[PDB]
Amino acid sequence: PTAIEHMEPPFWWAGMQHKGLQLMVHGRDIGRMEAALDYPGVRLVSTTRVPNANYLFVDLEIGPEAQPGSFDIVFKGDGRSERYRYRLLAREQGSAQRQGFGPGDAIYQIMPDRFANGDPSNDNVAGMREQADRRHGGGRHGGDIRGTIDHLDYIAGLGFTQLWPTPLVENDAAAYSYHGYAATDHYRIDPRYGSNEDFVRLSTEARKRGMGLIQDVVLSHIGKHHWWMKDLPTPDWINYGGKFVPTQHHRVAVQDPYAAQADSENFTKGWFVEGMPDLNQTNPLVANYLIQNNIWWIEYAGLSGLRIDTYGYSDGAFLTEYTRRLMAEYPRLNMVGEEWSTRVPVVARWQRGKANFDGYTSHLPSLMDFPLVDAMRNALSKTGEENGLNEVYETLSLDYLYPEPQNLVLFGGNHDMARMFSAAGEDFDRWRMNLVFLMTMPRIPQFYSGDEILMTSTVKGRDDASYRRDFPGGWAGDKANAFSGAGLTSQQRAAQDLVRKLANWRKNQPVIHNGRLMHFGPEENTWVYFRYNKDKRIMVAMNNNDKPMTLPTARFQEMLKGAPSGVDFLSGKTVGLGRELRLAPKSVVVIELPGLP
């Protein structure tokens, strides 16, 4: 590497909340250099060197008086001198107070490689290891930012207001580079997707269409081809470099009174696979590096939020500091952690404001509601069960375990589990139940691209590839084009129309966004709940049975308050509520009523 091969973060901003900036400089023997600079409002606090002489950590304090501009950082020693121009940018107006995604938002999740190939010329890039192969379920298909930007109208038109792409950061792996979860350069968008600048454009183009951009970040591990691996900054930059030490995934070991230190440590230091070295986040240099990088992306790309992958696999103390740092920069930001557990207490532990038995504290405002999604999928798929909806009911009843349950993200599905339609047994009626549930719950709804046209997958064994098929119309020459509707089946069109109708309708229902929820215990796989406030009541009634059901409305009078009828938004039909509610087989009704007294 050149005398200065990497300077991270590459530039910073005047007027950040946290004044300190720790530059990680990588370059041949840069570690033998002393650093200095001269710029008003910026102070060289110190520099740290480690046994690997190719790295230097330079600690700057950027004061409030620091202005946007640039200055040389000059290095001296080892018989030489080096200069590196460093830039401080002005922050965009309202940056710090940027509104993170919230309950009024609907999130559309894509996998960039699999959504739309707007530029076939970047499918392969000289110097990236893996060659594209659209025929390989785990290969690179060529989806890119240009493709995404080209279809933002479609996304906005469906009624979504936030775009969540899986990571776009460079993944220069020999295999499975497409998924994005094994970063080889945290400051660089993968060239196959586009340039850093294209990403910022994605954000600005999304913003024009009223959509925010949520970045998917990985904090716990990197790709084995990360440039650090060829020249480890320190002997303890990654955990267990020697013998491969896989994590055994005992997630409760970090929040369990009877835990063995060994399990807890295995959870946060163990590797997922030999292809993903685990970062030692108890190393302060690593912690700072990650915190800065994520802030950098938010500020640089004008993000509305983060989705933090494999949340709990990061060191607990690090997560506390990381969420604290991020939320201090962006107090209205939303960030959603992926804590993969269908147990409410296990997920709730991580949410900001949670009084934990062991004193653990956090500033993470949101988590993925796996428990609820699992309960609902179970209720839709377990046909052999007479009252499977009970699970949803009971899981929802545990919302008190979360400090802010209504800030959790509820998803119809995602790239790590079976397609919604298939989870529903490829039954439109049940799929529609899931959909209404998603659109009416006191949660932030997230929808997985492709589910709007009933894409299918397997439902057992390992088959991640089946969950991530190319969006039809994303590639030139596609038979079926979901963007235009050509080649779509009538059922797929009905599904797409239903999502458009529902999502667009939801954007105009503050009662769904902020209203209260009252649910009734399901009986015989029928379930009724209401969203309400003083302006409106929305009653959702579903009959998860292949037979008609009648529910006496006397039961729901505390919500119905004598309402004689209401119009079902789905069918437009008027539904009578005086005496009984007649639900057709496998149906769901969404009835709108005036507010309470």
529 is in an annotated binding site: no
Closest CB to Ca ion among residues 142, 212: 142
119 touches Ca ion (CB under 5 A): yes
- Sequence length of the chain is 597
Strand ranges, E, within 442-578: 444-448, 516-519, 526-532, 536-543, 549-552, 565-568, 574-576
387 is in an annotated binding site: no
Phi, psi of 547 (to 5 degrees): -160, 155
220 is in an annotated binding site: yes
Region from 136-144, 369-377, 433-441, 444-452 binding Ca ion, contact rule CB under 5 A: 136-144
Closest CB to Ca ion among residues 144, 299: 144
Q: How far is the CB of 115 from Ca ion (least distance, A)?
A: 10
Q: How far is the CB of 372 from Ca ion (least distance, A)?
A: 26
Taking the C-alpha atoms of residue 388 and residue 428, their distance in angstroms, rounded to an integer, is 18
Closest CB to Ca ion among residues 474, 515: 474
268 is in an annotated binding site: yes
130 touches Ca ion (CB under 5 A): no
Residues in a beta bridge with 278: 221
117 touches Ca ion (CB under 5 A): yes
Residue from 349, 376, 285 nearest 57 by CA = 285
Taking the C-alpha atoms of residue 354 and residue 493, their distance in angstroms, rounded to an integer, is 43
Q: How many CB atoms lie within 10 A of CB 28?
A: 15
Q: In this chain, which of 142, 223, 442, 450 binds Ca ion, going by CB under 5 A?
A: 142
220 touches Ca ion (CB under 5 A): yes
- DSSP class of residue 182 equals S
Phi, psi of 441 (to 5 degrees): -70, 155
Q: How far is the CB of 139 from Ca ion (least distance, A)?
A: 13
**Given 3-state DSSP classes, what are the helix, strand and coil percentages for the chain, each rounded to the nearest 5?**
30, 25, 45
Enumerate residues 250-279 that contact Ca ion by CB under 5 A.
268, 278
113 touches Ca ion (CB under 5 A): no
- Does residue 338 have an active-site annotation? yes
Which residues 6+ apart lie within 8 Å of 529 measured at CB?
Answer: 440, 517, 518, 519, 520, 539, 540
Q: How many CB atoms lie within 10 A of CB 95?
A: 16
Closest CB to Ca ion among residues 105, 278: 278
Which long-range contacts does 256-260 make (Cβ < 8 Å, 24+ apart)?
Answer: 257/357, 257/358
Query: How many CA atoms lie within 13 Å of 440's alpha carbon, on the beta-carbon side?
Result: 28
474 touches Ca ion (CB under 5 A): no
Enumerate residues 14-43 that contact Ca ion by CB under 5 A.
none
Which residues 6+ apart lie within 8 Å of 465 measured at CB?
Answer: 137, 138
Query: With CB under 5 A, what is the number of residues at the site for Ca ion?
Result: 10
Closest CB to Ca ion among residues 318, 421: 318
144 is in an annotated binding site: yes
Q: Which residue in the list 185, 205, 309, 429 is annotated as catalytic?
A: 309
Q: Which residue in the list 150, 263, 315, 338 is annotated as catalytic?
A: 338
The sign one gets for the Cα dihedral 447, 449, 454, 458 is: negative
395 touches Ca ion (CB under 5 A): no
568 is in an annotated binding site: no
Q: How far is the CB of 471 from Ca ion (least distance, A)?
A: 13
Q: In this chain, which of 109, 122, 148, 177 binds Ca ion, going by CB under 5 A?
A: 122
70 is in an annotated binding site: no
Region from 101-109, 110-118, 334-342, 500-508 binding Ca ion, contact rule CB under 5 A: 110-118
- Does residue 309 have an active-site annotation? yes
Closest CB to Ca ion among residues 119, 568: 119
Q: State the catalytic residues.
A: 309, 338
Q: Which residues are annotated as part of the binding site?
A: 117, 119, 122-123, 142, 144, 220, 268, 278, 313
Binding-site ranges for Ca ion (CB under 5 A): 117, 119, 122-123, 142, 144, 220, 268, 278, 313
